[PDB]
């Protein structure tokens, strides 16, 4: 959609990452596996709960009877009251329905940016040190152990540390 990540450059979901909305998959000499990005997942639960409450919280409403009884010689007031009942009904049905359609689009668009910003955040860290292979993947031009992998996921990737190894591998691949 809107940010190009979800169902865009990152084709599909992961039934393997069960600990969060957004995260990572890795491969190294030690092993593979999925992990959720805590910082983004949490903030997003926090914000989505806020949005969910807001739609519900702001309602409040009065103590109302709704029903009114009118006699055989009070059809005009009885119809006036149905007009009030029907008019509010049309207001509430239309708004509820439009609010939900517009906000469901805005929610998915939000999950798209979260996944897009996550890709970009890493791309900014690794720079020259990894190859962007598409599908939201990076192929490290250097040896990236569970520790190194964790540094990236935690947003503390040390680019000058792996630079030399990555420059020689890249320069050999590009050769």
């Amino acid at each position: 959609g809107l940010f190009g990540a979800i169902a865009g450059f990152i084709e599909g979901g992961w039934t393997g990452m069960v600990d969060g909305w957004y995260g990572y998959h890795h491969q190294n000499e030690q092993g593979s596996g999925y992990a959720a990005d805590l910082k983004s997942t949490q903030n997003a639960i926090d914000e989505i709960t806020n949005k969910v409450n807001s739609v519900i919280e702001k309602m409040n409403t009065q103590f109302t009877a709704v029903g009114k009884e009118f006699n055989h010689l009070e059809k005009r007031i009885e119809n006036l009251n149905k007009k009030v009942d029907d008019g509010f009904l049309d207001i509430w049905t239309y708004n509820a329905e439009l609010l939900v359609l517009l906000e469901n689009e805005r929610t998915l668009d939000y999950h798209d940016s979260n996944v897009k910003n996550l890709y970009e955040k890493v791309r900014s860290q690794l720079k020259n040190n990894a190859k962007e292979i598409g599908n939201g993947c990076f192929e490290f031009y250097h040896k990236c152990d569970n520790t190194c992998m964790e540094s990236v996921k935690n947003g503390t990737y040390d680019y000058p540390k792996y630079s030399e190894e990555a420059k020689l591998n890249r320069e050999e691949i590009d050769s």
């Binding site: 959609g1 990540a5 169902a7 990152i10 599909g12 979901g13 992961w14 039934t15 990452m17 069960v18 969060g20 909305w21 957004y22 995260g23 990572y24 998959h25 890795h26 491969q27 190294n28 969910v52 739609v55 309602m59 409403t61 009065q62 103590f63 109302t64 009877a65 709704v66 029903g67 009114k68 009884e69 009118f70 009070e74 009942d85 509010f88 009904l89 509430w92 049905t93 509820a96 329905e97 939900v100 359609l101 517009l102 469901n104 689009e105 929610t107 998915l108 999950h111 996944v115 996550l118 890709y119 599908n135 939201g136 993947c137 990076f138 192929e139 490290f140 040896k143 990236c144 992998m149």
Partner: protein, 323 residues
């Protein structure tokens, strides 16, 4: 070595509709539409409804002989009638400002039935034992309303009637009375003797002189005569006078009460249960955690807004692409 950024997919089958696509599968979602009701008429804010069984407001309030009357409750959050609730005004006539009275009585916070004009002491020169009718049968015998007394002549004599009630109750007193409109000159004579009669009733706020309209009406419940029903609320220290020379269906029981802000009358076959609710529907009570409901447009309580929606699913998670 690879690092892949991705997103969660799951066992979720739930769908939301967006402005751009209809059936989008989401990993997580919240329903905003209360589609369920408990199928019971509950106490509204810890206060039980006044369930009128086979009787209607008129029946219960006039003390129709088929209605309990000696088993109400000092308070009610709302009143319940059943769609079949037939027992009301058994003597045919108009019950003036009836819906207004139903509205006033929909909710109450204090309610006490008391003998305004006690039977054995109030009418020493009028007959208070006869004045039962085939119009009101109860348990095989000619009966009448419990809350009123149909005064009739004391064997050839209907002297002038003049009786008042103050109000030492520190709340409004609902006083109901009836005006008898006989069928013929013979029916007037047999009940009251005096041919040209009048009824006068007055308070500080109320004043009406009634004149019986003798005429044969089409037979309703064996009656060609009619009886009109009247009511007034007598303020905490006001007086109500009853003056008559005939045709006065006199108040016997009146009601000290405090009207509660504003409720309604649910006409329903829904059974009453010992449950609490913030919102009552004619067909079952509803939770108020959600902003909307599609159960019933006519609700009583602090209620979600009725919508003609069948689904209002709000996405929380993302698109579920398990591919």
């Amino acid at each position: 070595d690879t690092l892949c950024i991705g997103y969660h997919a799951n066992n979720s089958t739930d769908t939301v509709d967006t402005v751009l696509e209809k059936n989008v599968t989401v990993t997580h979602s919240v329903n905003l539409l209360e589609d369920k009701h408990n199928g019971k008429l509950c106490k509204l804010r810890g206060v039980a409804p006044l369930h009128l069984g086979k009787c209607n407001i008129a029946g219960w309030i006039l003390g129709n002989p088929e209605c309990e009357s000696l088993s109400t409750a000092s308070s009610w959050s709302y009143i319940v009638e059943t769609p079949s609730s037939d027992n009301g005004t058994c003597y045919p006539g108009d019950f003036i400002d009836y819906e207004e009275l139903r509205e006033q009585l929909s909710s109450v916070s204090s309610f006490e039935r008391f003998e305004i004009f006690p039977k054995t002491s109030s009418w020493p020169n009028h007959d208070s034992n006869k004045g039962v009718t085939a119009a009101c049968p109860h348990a095989g015998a000619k009966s009448f309303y419990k809350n009123l007394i149909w005064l009739v002549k004391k064997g050839n004599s209907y002297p002038k009637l003049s009786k008042s009630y103050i109000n030492d109750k520190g709340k409004e007193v609902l006083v109901l009375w009836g005006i008898h409109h006989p069928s013929t000159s013979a029916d007037q004579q047999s009940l009251y003797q005096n041919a040209d009669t009048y009824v006068f009733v007055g308070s500080s706020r109320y004043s009406k002189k009634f004149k019986p309209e003798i005429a044969i009406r089409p037979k309703v419940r064996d009656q060609e005569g009619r009886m009109n029903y009247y009511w007034t609320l007598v303020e905490p220290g006001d007086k109500i006078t009853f003056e008559a020379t005939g045709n006065l269906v006199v108040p016997r029981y009146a009601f000290a009460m405090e009207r509660n802000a504003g409720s309604g009358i649910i006409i329903s076959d829904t059974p009453v249960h010992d449950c609490n609710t913030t919102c009552q529907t004619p067909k079952g009570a509803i939770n108020t955690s959600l902003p909307f409901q599609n159960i019933h447009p006519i609700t009583i309580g602090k209620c979600p807004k009725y919508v003609k929606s069948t689904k209002l699913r709000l996405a929380t998670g993302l698109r579920n692409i398990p591919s």
